[PDB]
From a paper:
We have biochemically and structurally characterized a minimalist inositol phosphate [name] (i.e., TvIPK) encoded by Terrestrivirus, a nucleocytoplasmic large (“giant”) DNA virus (NCLDV). We show that TvIPK can synthesize inositol pyrophosphates from a range of scyllo- and myo-IPs, both in vitro and when expressed in yeast cells. We find a heart-shaped ligand binding pocket comprising an array of positively charged and flexible side chains, underlying the observed substrate diversity. A crucial arginine residue in a conserved “G-loop” orients the γ-phosphate of ATP to allow substrate pyrophosphorylation.
For each asymmetric unit, there is one molecule of TvIPK17-265 in the C2221 space group. The N-terminal residues 17–47 could not be traced, either in this crystal complex, or in a binary complex of full-length TvIPK plus ADP, or in a number of TvIPK17-265/ADP complexes into which we soaked a variety of inositol phosphates.
Author numbering: 49 to 263
Amino acid sequence: IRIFPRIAGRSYIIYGQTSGIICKRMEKSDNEFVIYNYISEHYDKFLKKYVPKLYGKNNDMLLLEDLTYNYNNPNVMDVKIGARKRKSHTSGFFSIRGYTNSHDYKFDPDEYLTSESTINHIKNFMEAGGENRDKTKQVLLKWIMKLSELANDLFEINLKFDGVSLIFIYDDDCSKCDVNVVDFSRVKLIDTNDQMTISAVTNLIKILSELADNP
Ligand SMILES: Nc1ncnc2c1ncn2[C@@H]1O[C@H](COP(=O)(O)OP(=O)(O)O)[C@@H](O)[C@H]1O
Ligand SMILES: [Mg+2]
Ligand SMILES: [Mg+2]
C-alpha cells in the first residue's frame, strides 16, 4: 500500500492500484459520494470544469483523479473556502490548510493571520517557481482565469459548500498549473447560492491579481 503525500486534511488517502488514481476513504459518512452524484445529475458542467473526476467507488473508498499525476515537480496548496465546522477562518474569508515546503516557512494552520501574513504565505508557496517573473505571472493569470469563472458559476448553484478546499498546483518549471474544488463531505442542499464561498473566491482573485501586477 502506498500512502498519498497529502499536503493537508486528515482522511486516509492512498495511491490507486493503477496510474493516475488516488483512493480516498469516506471516514464519517458517504455524504461525499451522495454529493458527487447530486452534482453529476444537477450541475454536470460544474463537475467537469472544477472537480477531480470520480472514477467510481470500492467499498468506503472513492476512486478520484490524481490532480498531481502529470507533474514532474508539483507544488500544492490547500485553501479551505467553505465554512469551517466551528471556528472562524484564519485569513478572514478563507483558511490556508497547507502547502509544499510550508514547514520551511514555519507555517501553522491554527495561526490567525493578518492580510500581510496571508499574502506572504501565498508568496512563500510561489517561491519554488523560481526567479522567471514571466512564467510565475502566467501561473497566477491561469489561476485567476479559472477562479473568476468559478465565482461567476457559483451564483447559480444551490449548495452550501461547507468544508470544501481549492487545491492549487503548479510545476517547479511553471510549464503547467491548475486549481480544483475538493472535499464534498460536509456539503448540503439549500434554496439559495453560497455567498460566503463566493466571498472566499473573490478575495483570492483580488490577492492573486495584486501578485500578478505587482512589479
Ligand atoms: N483528487 C486529488 N488529487 C490530488 N490530491 C488530492 C486530491 N484530493 C485530495 N487531495 C489531497 O488530499 C488533501 C486532503 O483532501 P480532502 O478531500 O480535503 O480530504 P480531508 O477529508 O482529509 O480534508 C488535500 O490537501 C490534497 O493534498
Ligand atoms: Mg479537506
Ligand atoms: Mg480537470
